[PDB]
UniProtKB/Swiss-Prot annotation:
Intracellular or extracellular location(s): Nucleus; Chromosome
Residue(s) at site: Acetylated histone binding: 99
Post-translational modification remark: Phosphorylation by CK2 disrupt the intramolecular binding between the bromo domain 2 and the NPS region and promotes binding between the NPS and the BID regions, leading to activate the protein and promote binding to acetylated histones. In absence of phosphorylation, BRD4 does not localize to p53/TP53 target gene promoters, phosphorylation promoting recruitment to p53/TP53 target promoters.
Free-text note regarding domains: The NET domain mediates interaction with a number of chromatin proteins involved in transcription regulation (NSD3, JMJD6, CHD4, GLTSCR1 and ATAD5). The C-terminal (CTD) region mediates interaction and recruitment of CDK9 and CCNT1 subunits of the P-TEFb complex. It is also required for maintenance of higher-order chromatin structure.
Record protein name field: Bromodomain-containing protein 4
Part of the intact protein present: 44 to 168 of 1362
Gene name of the record: BRD4
Annotated disease: Cornelia de Lange syndrome 6: A form of Cornelia de Lange syndrome, a clinically heterogeneous developmental disorder associated with malformations affecting multiple systems. It is characterized by facial dysmorphisms, abnormal hands and feet, growth delay, cognitive retardation, hirsutism, gastroesophageal dysfunction and cardiac, ophthalmologic and genitourinary anomalies. CDLS6 inheritance is autosomal dominant. A chromosomal aberration involving BRD4 is found in a rare, aggressive, and lethal carcinoma arising in midline organs of young people. Translocation t(15;19)(q14;p13) with NUTM1 which produces a BRD4-NUTM1 fusion protein.
Species this protein is from: Homo sapiens (Human)
Remarks, miscellaneous: JQ1, a thieno-triazolo-1,4-diazepine derivative, and I-BET, a benzodiazepine derivative, have been tested on tumors with success. Treatment with GSK1210151A (I-BET151, a I-BET derivative) has strong effets on mixed lineage leukemia and promotes myeloid differentiation and leukemia stem-cell depletion.
Domain of life: Eukaryota
Tissue: Ubiquitously expressed.
Assembly with partners or alone: Interacts with p53/TP53; the interaction is direct. Interacts (via CTD region) with CDK9 and CCNT1, acting as an associated component of P-TEFb complex. Interacts with RELA (when acetylated at 'Lys-310'). Interacts (via NET domain) with NSD3, CHD4, BICRA and ATAD5. The interaction with BICRA bridges BRD4 to the GBAF complex. Interacts (via NET domain) with JMJD6 (via JmjC and N-terminal domains); the interaction is stronger in presence of ssRNA and recruits JMJD6 on distal enhancers. Interacts with NSD3. Interacts with NIPBL.
Length: 127
């Protein structure tokens, strides 16, 4: 069995900038979800080899995890907040697509997604 390479977190060809919205996404949103008791399955790519999930990367074609998001934010990989918000929504969506309702990992994603929603509701206006 083999894992795919992870999503890129560095690419000099990609336009990027610092925004106050991206600063919020690191200092408030990522920091809140990372420290949560349910963060740990989401803090690095799914290891489909060690978890014995040989179908995972047949069903999940756009993988994403908060380890990737954290490096993207710390490396200033994004152009705008919408790109980073899309990564969070991909991560949650992938968990719901692969798993079934009421599975423990779905309850964990739901608890993280509720905090995510509460924090991005107060995303600051761009300066
Ligand atoms: C490190 C990761 S990543 C990750 C899991 C783990 C352990 C993780 C997980 C699981 C439980 C907790 Cl508390 C927590 C997490 N889940 C995986 C998906 C997965 O293994 N599915 C297989 C089954 C796991 C269980 C339940 C069903 C019946 C049995 C036993 C097999 C399905 C997964 N998906 N998305 C992500 C992200 N994960």
């Amino acid at each position: 069995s083999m894992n795919p390479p992870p999503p890129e977190t560095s690419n000099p060809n990609k336009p990027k900038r610092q925004t106050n919205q991206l600063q919020y996404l690191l200092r408030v949103v990522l920091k809140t979800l990372w420290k949560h008791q349910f963060a740990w399955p989401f803090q690095q790519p799914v290891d489909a080899v060690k978890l014995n999930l040989p179908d995972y990367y047949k069903i999940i074609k756009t993988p994403m995890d908060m380890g990737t998001i954290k490096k993207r934010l710390e490396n200033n990989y994004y152009w705008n907040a919408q790109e980073c918000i899309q990564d969070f929504n991909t991560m949650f969506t992938n968990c719901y697509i692969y798993n079934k309702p009421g599975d423990d990992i779905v309850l964990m994603a739901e608890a993280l997604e509720k905090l995510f929603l509460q924090k991005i509701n107060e995303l600051p206006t761009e300066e």
